[PDB]
Amino acid sequence: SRRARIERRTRESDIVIELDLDGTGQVAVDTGVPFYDHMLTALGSHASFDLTVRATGDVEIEAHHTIEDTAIALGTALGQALGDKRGIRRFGDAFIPMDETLAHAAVDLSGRPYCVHTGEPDHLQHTTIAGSSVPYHTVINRHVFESLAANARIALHVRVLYGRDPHHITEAQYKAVARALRQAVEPDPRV
Amino acid sequence: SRRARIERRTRESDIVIELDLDGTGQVAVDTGVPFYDHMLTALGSHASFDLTVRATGDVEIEAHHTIEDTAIALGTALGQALGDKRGIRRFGDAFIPMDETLAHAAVDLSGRPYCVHTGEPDHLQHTTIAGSSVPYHTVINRHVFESLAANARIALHVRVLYGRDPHHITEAQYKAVARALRQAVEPDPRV
Amino acid sequence: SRRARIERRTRESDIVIELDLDGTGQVAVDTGVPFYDHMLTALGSHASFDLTVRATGDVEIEAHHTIEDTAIALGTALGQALGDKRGIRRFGDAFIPMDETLAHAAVDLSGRPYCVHTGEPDHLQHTTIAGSSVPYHTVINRHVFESLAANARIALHVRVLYGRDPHHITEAQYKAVARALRQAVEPDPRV
Amino acid sequence: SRRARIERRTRESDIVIELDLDGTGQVAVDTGVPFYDHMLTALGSHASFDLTVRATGDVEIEAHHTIEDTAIALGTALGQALGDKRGIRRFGDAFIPMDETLAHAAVDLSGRPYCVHTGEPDHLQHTTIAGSSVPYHTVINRHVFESLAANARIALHVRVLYGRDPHHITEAQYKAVARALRQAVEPDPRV
Amino acid sequence: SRRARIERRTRESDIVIELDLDGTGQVAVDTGVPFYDHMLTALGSHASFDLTVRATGDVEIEAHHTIEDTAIALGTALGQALGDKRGIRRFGDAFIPMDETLAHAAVDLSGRPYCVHTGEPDHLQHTTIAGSSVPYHTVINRHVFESLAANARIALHVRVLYGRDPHHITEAQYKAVARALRQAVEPDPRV
Amino acid sequence: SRRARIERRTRESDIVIELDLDGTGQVAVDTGVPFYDHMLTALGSHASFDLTVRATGDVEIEAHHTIEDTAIALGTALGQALGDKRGIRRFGDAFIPMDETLAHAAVDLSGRPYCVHTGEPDHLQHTTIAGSSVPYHTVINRHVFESLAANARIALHVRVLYGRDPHHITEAQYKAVARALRQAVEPDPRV
Numbered sequence A, B, C, D, E, F: 001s002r003r004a005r006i007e008r009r010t011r012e013s014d015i016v017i018e019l020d021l022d023g024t025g026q027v028a029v030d031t032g033v034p035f036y037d038h039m040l041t042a043l044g045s046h047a048s049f050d051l052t053v054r055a056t057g058d059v060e061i062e063a064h065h066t067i068e069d070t071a072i073a074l075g076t077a078l079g080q081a082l083g084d085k086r087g088i089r090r091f092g093d094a095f096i097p098m099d100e101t102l103a104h105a106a107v108d109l110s111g112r113p114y115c116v117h118t119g120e121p122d123h124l125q126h127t128t129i130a131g132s133s134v135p136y137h138t139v140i141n142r143h144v145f146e147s148l149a150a151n152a153r154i155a156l157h158v159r160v161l162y163g164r165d166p167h168h169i170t171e172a173q174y175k176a177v178a179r180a181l182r183q184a185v186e187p188d189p190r191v
């Protein structure tokens, strides 16, 4: 049984995560930042996790605090669910083509906490993805991966080999992390 | 059953493709362009497809029309054989070292049709691979991958990381696409 | 049964290798160069080999002759244990994140002998990893991979995508080769 | 007696080599690639070998497979004929002026397998030498020397110091290798 | 008879050299700097000298004084053994391929004392070759050749055409000098 | 018997050459240009020719016409003495260190007439070597080698790898040509 429930209450936000590593992509995310919900839903489904996330935070300011607190809580949940990490593949990686974009992630689940994020086009440091609700500033992508890695205590390397559309670039990175985690957490039939 | 038969008659060529995705590399290719036959035989074998290709076309002009019509027909056959794509891995990638050459392909079988082809040395835009029959102009490699992707309705990213010999560079790309497809079409035991 | 015992006596060194490709990471290495023992222990464990290496050589001069003779003997053992290579995956690759470092290896076990080694920072051509015993000059990393590839008769491509610490860069490369071999030697259930 | 007969049958080609290192330039080559036959005839004569080569292969594709299989077989034959290499000069080198072209080769017959090929003008990566039969793509020159070195298990360094005409550049390299081998295989009256 | 015995006692070291130019590579070297012993053993063997070197010096400081005093003594011995230089080839040169490295030496035994040393990679000015004993700083290679040339009273030109590994670069230079001397000291049947 | 006598009378000069290829360096040169006499004496001795040259010409103008007519006559004599060139080494090369200067020459005696002259420092296009008699303009060095090659009907490649002193650079080139010819004209015991 590789399950965790994390509750995180801060001045800024209130988070509940229910995570099962050995799921079928049963995923429900509600953070009040709908593009983020879309990215964490993609992450949960492509990782074949069962994942519920419920977060409420200070989105009057902007999404940053809620996004960061959610990624910290989600990282904590991944680390707790992995437990002793005995008998798992440990290493995982995935390429994700998305139209013009190619992204990649590699993970070491028994590595010390580390995040390297490279290749993201410079326009993603000031791009906003905006709809009818709270917008998502793509500059936070790096912060999400750093927060996940630091709190799950894993080595996570995210690369954008190339791309143009900020939605494609962002979504391909979340999916790549997801498929890299899925491979790494898998039981290893020889180890 | 993941099988397709495509017949394609144009002004320029007459093509028959019989494709089974769940094969053992039973492959027979005859297009009248022998280097192309070698590349599609490699593609069929390394993908563990069963594949018959019979093509006759206007090779008095050059191989281009026959090569393009064959890749369109083969793309159509791959898309038809994949059907609803339910329960498959969806994503696949492969590195192919071939002496001095390293090539890579990544695929998303449920992605919208897209092809990105990068890293091929500039001399491949005017190289000919010639023997005793109809020659193969390596400039067509990009056209083959674009045609396959557009007609199978998949995202296909082909990269040459480095290399020198045009036969090694070309063959490593066809093989990389082949092994990437093989992984992507595989049943996914969790999805 | 995919096992080899290689004995190699030269003017410079005396080597015994016992290798089983179908192991559980039962690994014992003693060469008189303790950082090398650490790298070959990582290679044996991450490849899920059973591996014993016993080497004595002219370390009064430096580690080079012992290191090279061991990699030649180990390459010979890998080639002999693979035998006819019937029914195996053939192709393998692995990414290894190690803190700030990302390394990659790709292999073709039925390729002609070839080694390409790229991306290693320039400071690794004159770095020493020194403890209380015989030191390890990181310039030899390339020589180890070339020797393994040439004597196993395989295509081996080792890349450092980025990194800083010479111990991380070296160890991530040995591990990447190890996991690439593990995937390549695996029985292929379709071929 | 320093003689070898090598038979090599692959999917692509059928090769027979009869080699005597202590010959008088009695040479007969037939591969179905007439410029290659000319180069291997030059190599056999200038090395003062007796050499017969009979090769049939898939020249409908192009010369590459036949050329590579022949150089592998010829390398194997050179290594087998050299046997223990006791009492030979070991080291050999030769300069070959050919009109505007100067080429050089150096060999170490007891060196580990290694090939360095430098100085060839960039136009030789896409040049064809074509007559009334199967053409010869000069990009393969490097591949021939690498194949010979890897299968004879020798160190072979081929340089083009300068030149223009692709036939002169190619022929001067084959001749330089030939005269370098002739010096290296010679009995050494002091060793 | 082309023999010399040189005894050299300085504040720093005590050297005995026994040299025969007309030897069979009967070589014994002991200087307390084991990589240097390896290089002078290679020099003695490849020159087909009979050579004994016994040196003890101030290796608590570093190898430099012992290395320099030995090369001065060895140069003196070569000059004394050559005597009047009547009837010898006078000129000699040798290429030495060593894996990735190519080195060359040319000599004029009746030239005025002169040494030109070129092409050595810049990392060799601060590289150490270290084992379990006294290390060898490759910056001294130039000093060794200058000392040999100045004390034998010969013109000696040492070149590194290319290379990477400091052990290969150093050893190929000592061997090249050795084979160049062997050719130059040979009786000339026409002069 | 490999001997020639050439008499050449032009408007500008009167030349007699007596050449024996199979000599012992019995050499006598008198052209009225004493530095040229020194260079042709070096060429004759180092080639182990027997050579007499007697030339009188229009040195009131400068040495050029006498120097060129002598090199044409000497080239003619070399070609006539070589006769059918049956059973000779054919190829020859030599490195000549001269203090700071290194020069090289390579020859093919059965090559079509060709001369390539490279590496000479730019100051040699306007340097004069002057004593108490008719001076020698080093710009003529290229012209001498071109004239020799064109009239002997040989391929001759002369290189200066480096140097400073115009007397050393010039003399090392004449000597290098000389030793290259000596090797090339030698009977070949296997051909």
Ligand SMILES: [Cl-]
Pocket (backbone or CB within 6 Å): none
């Ligand atoms: Cl990559």
Ligand SMILES: [Cl-]
Pocket (backbone or CB within 6 Å): none
């Ligand atoms: Cl050179």
Ligand SMILES: [Mn+2]
Pocket (backbone or CB within 6 Å): A064, A068, A143
């Ligand atoms: Mn923050």
Ligand SMILES: [Mn+2]
Pocket (backbone or CB within 6 Å): A038, A167, A171
């Ligand atoms: Mn989306």
Ligand SMILES: [Mn+2]
Pocket (backbone or CB within 6 Å): B064, B068, B143
């Ligand atoms: Mn088209």
Ligand SMILES: [Mn+2]
Pocket (backbone or CB within 6 Å): B038, B167, B171, D065
């Ligand atoms: Mn092929």
Ligand SMILES: [Mn+2]
Pocket (backbone or CB within 6 Å): C064, C068, C143, E099, E168
């Ligand atoms: Mn080595």
Ligand SMILES: [Mn+2]
Pocket (backbone or CB within 6 Å): C038, C167, C171
């Ligand atoms: Mn470590």
Ligand SMILES: [Mn+2]
Pocket (backbone or CB within 6 Å): B099, B168, D064, D068, D143
């Ligand atoms: Mn090939």
Ligand SMILES: [Mn+2]
Pocket (backbone or CB within 6 Å): D038, D167, D171
């Ligand atoms: Mn020719």
Ligand SMILES: [Mn+2]
Pocket (backbone or CB within 6 Å): E064, E068, E143
């Ligand atoms: Mn000193």
Ligand SMILES: [Mn+2]
Pocket (backbone or CB within 6 Å): C065, E038, E167, E171
């Ligand atoms: Mn050594």
Ligand SMILES: [Mn+2]
Pocket (backbone or CB within 6 Å): F064, F068, F143
């Ligand atoms: Mn003129």
Ligand SMILES: [Mn+2]
Pocket (backbone or CB within 6 Å): F038, F167, F171
């Ligand atoms: Mn002089």
